[PDB]
Amino acid sequence: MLKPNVAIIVAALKPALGIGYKGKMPWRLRKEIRYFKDVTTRTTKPNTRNAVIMGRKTWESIPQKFRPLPDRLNIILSRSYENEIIDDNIIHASSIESSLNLVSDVERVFIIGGAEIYNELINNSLVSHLLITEIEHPSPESIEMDTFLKFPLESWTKQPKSELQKFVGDTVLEDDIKEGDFTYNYTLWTRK
Ligand SMILES: NC(=O)C1=CN([C@@H]2O[C@H](COP(=O)(O)OP(=O)(O)OC[C@H]3O[C@@H](n4cnc5c(N)ncnc54)[C@H](OP(=O)(O)O)[C@@H]3O)[C@@H](O)[C@H]2O)C=CC1
Ligand SMILES: Nc1nc(N)c2c(Sc3ccccc3)cccc2n1
């Protein structure tokens, strides 16, 4: 696949954009997880699949029995990896672009984390869309976190919900989803 448009998908707590704590997510939002699954799995084309790219640490955080993520091509990046097709569902690579040369029959490509991956790859011009779940809590500074996005949001434009809906197609998009003390909304951003 030559120069595909790639999207980052992440859930972050406002206003600091915290995303993790000691290798884990700082919340368990059941509905958000199902949205993640639907968005990264759904395709429009016939014999296609989407690809999900992640850093080695994120991969290793999934219990062995639950990896690869089903129904998507999984790509794992490590600076130590050779560019290798493991099986039909798993690819090893040392760079995003290199990994994409190994794929065919992919519709969309999503970067799913983690922090190092996100913070590096946001500056790669292949990245054209950000799908950010914006989480809010009454006392954000009560939720322990050690990992944050460092995204140059002044160079991006948040689109109206209508553009998000068009991006996700079928997927039901509820507003102001509340779970425990957290309230969240899905957003789409594109480059200025
Ligand atoms: N809130 C959310 O939506 C999400 C949050 N997260 C959170 O992120 C945190 C984990 O992030 P982090 O620890 O940074 O791990 P990552 O998943 O980002 O993995 C980092 C590893 O990826 C490899 N890597 C990183 N950058 C590159 C690059 N540019 N090219 C090639 N290989 C690269 C390296 O592997 P090697 O060392 O082998 O070279 C590096 O050690 C956790 O707290 C997790 O919960 C994760 C996903 C979503
Ligand atoms: N919006 C969004 N973005 C992601 N990247 C998510 C991920 S990615 C992940 C995959 C395996 C292990 C840890 C995180 C997991 C759960 C919910 C997620 N929500």
UniProtKB/Swiss-Prot annotation:
One GO term under biological process is:
folic acid metabolic process
Q: Which family does it belong to?
A: Belongs to the dihydrofolate reductase family.
Q: What is its EC number?
A: 1.5.1.3
Positions bound to NADP(+): 11, 18-24, 56-58, 78-80, 113-120
Enzyme group, top EC level?
oxidoreductase
GO cellular component annotations, sorted alphabetically? Answer: mitochondrion
Q: Name one GO molecular function term.
A: NADP binding
- Summarize the protein's role: Key enzyme in folate metabolism. Catalyzes an essential reaction for de novo glycine and purine synthesis, and for DNA precursor synthesis.
Designated name of the protein: Dihydrofolate reductase
Q: Which UniProt keywords apply?
A: NADP, One-carbon metabolism, Oxidoreductase
Domain named DHFR is located at 5-191
Naturally occurring in which organism (per UniProt): Candida albicans (Yeast)
Gene name for this UniProt entry: DFR1
Q: Which residues are listed for substrate binding in this entry?
A: 32-37, 72, 112, 118
Q: Which reaction does it catalyse?
A: (6S)-5,6,7,8-tetrahydrofolate + NADP(+) = 7,8-dihydrofolate + NADPH + H(+)
Pathway given in the UniProt record: Cofactor biosynthesis; tetrahydrofolate biosynthesis; 5,6,7,8-tetrahydrofolate from 7,8-dihydrofolate: step 1/1
